[PDB]
Amino acid sequence: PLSAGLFKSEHKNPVPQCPPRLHVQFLSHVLWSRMPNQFLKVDVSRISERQGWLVQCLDPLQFMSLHIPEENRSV
């Protein structure tokens, strides 16, 4: 029945209140990304054969990703 009454815990509240989480966010550019200290280390062909363009990578690599659900974003 309401905007704020659909993405919160309760839904039977027909009063239009604004929780402190509802704050406007602008598409900004002041941000920093982190470069991993270990990439996948993939070699493609190193022979460049005539039977196709090869790529091969057997060494695995995993990382732990935090997930913000309210923003639906992984970091």
Added chain:
Amino acid sequence: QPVQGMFENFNIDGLFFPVVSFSAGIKVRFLLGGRHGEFKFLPPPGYAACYEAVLPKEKLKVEHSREYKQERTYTRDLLGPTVSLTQAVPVDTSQIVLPPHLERIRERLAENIHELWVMNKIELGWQYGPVRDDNKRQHPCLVEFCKLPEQERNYNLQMSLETLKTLLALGCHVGIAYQLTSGYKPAPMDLSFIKLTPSQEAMVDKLAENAHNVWARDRIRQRRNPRLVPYTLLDDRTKKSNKDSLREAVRTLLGYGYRFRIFRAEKTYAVKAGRWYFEFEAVTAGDMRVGWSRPGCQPDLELGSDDRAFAFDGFKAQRWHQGNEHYGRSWQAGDVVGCMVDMNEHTMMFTLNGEILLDDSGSELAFKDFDVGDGFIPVCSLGVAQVGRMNFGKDVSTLKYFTICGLQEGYEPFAVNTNRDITMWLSKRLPQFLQVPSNHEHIEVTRIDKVTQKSFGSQNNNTDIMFYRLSMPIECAXXXXXXXXXXXXXXXXXXXXXXXXXXXXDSDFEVLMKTAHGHLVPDRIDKDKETPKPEFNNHKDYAQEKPSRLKQXXXXXXXXXXXXX
């Protein structure tokens, strides 16, 4: 056998390409034609392939679509933004009238081109005859201008007029200032004597460009030809052939006399005491700055603009702070520069290939009497088409100019007492959504509270578009999902109803006036309702609900769509 799935109605704009994504434990083989690969099946009727899509005279190589995705040592070519590379029309000729005082000159140039073209055939020794063919070595245009009809005269003068018109249109007006044959004597004048000026050389070059442009625009209707590719990408042999062939005309004519990216170390490695030194190698010589920035620097402003960064540039040979002052000299392609910071006596120095830089006052140190604050981080900034390599130490065998300068004075590298390499924090390109800060200009958002509102407020001199968005989105899974935009008068607007399990986040893209009070209000009539209440000058502002979409530009159409079948 094909699949039953297609991505119709998608954004046709953009440079598409084959791309594979693999995690680990994988052995994939792309298959093209020719020497690149080996076809195992047959292509669909008419569909070409990438071994033909590759540009002529170019080696086709596989490489990471994303970035310099090489698990290597510190010797990684860090590059900033890139140019378009022109990876994707003739000049207008007929827009000016034809003066009659040079119509005689134009006819004489037409007969010049005609005699040029028939002596082109006489070099091989063609014969006069009534039948038209190429392999038979015969040409019916051996007859002179008194007997040949006007239609063929017009079709031959087509070329001559086109060329002479483009010759006027380059910006310079053009006014007035044996051997055996069957009866034709082609010899207007001497040609090898006179020397053509480079101005008219470039003129005839741009003219050949124009001619091949119209020829290609006419030939694209008649598939994937090296001649079909524009003249600027043609082979140099045929280039020079056409260039000289069309320069003969002007030789005869003159004869008689008619987004930067900022990289840095991690902010936790801030230093406040001691002698620190780090190298920066620049492969190119474009716009590049290097120095030491405090742990508050902005990743979009130029390095060294505000007091939050102490930088130096080689493109202008000057140090970068609040203000600008000439300092040191510029570098070349493939140079190194070692930056030194002594925190105990608060000195900053730069050594270009061992030679320590010097300003006008004779002071070797760049900056003096700077507070320690909360530290200094090695930082660099690369503009368009730049290639750099940072070295915070940890490899003295590769620290070339470190044992030359600084080692004996008492300077040590940044990360030499270190077991694991630095994180190398860069400036990201995706413009994520950030909450409105309090210490920000031209963006002020209030909070009032009957109904609750979130009013806006701004003050500045430069206008632009913002992409405001709510914090928490609304999801629906897995029932009916329809988004209807209803105005105050009626619901006569665009209604989108396609969402299986998406999280549509409320948003408004607004243009910023001198006074903008447009806001969002959670209202209620029968269901969830948000009213984006605008004010005066509401004609280019949009208000809708969007999933994760992070693109900074200025448009309303082509918002990257798709429909699966």
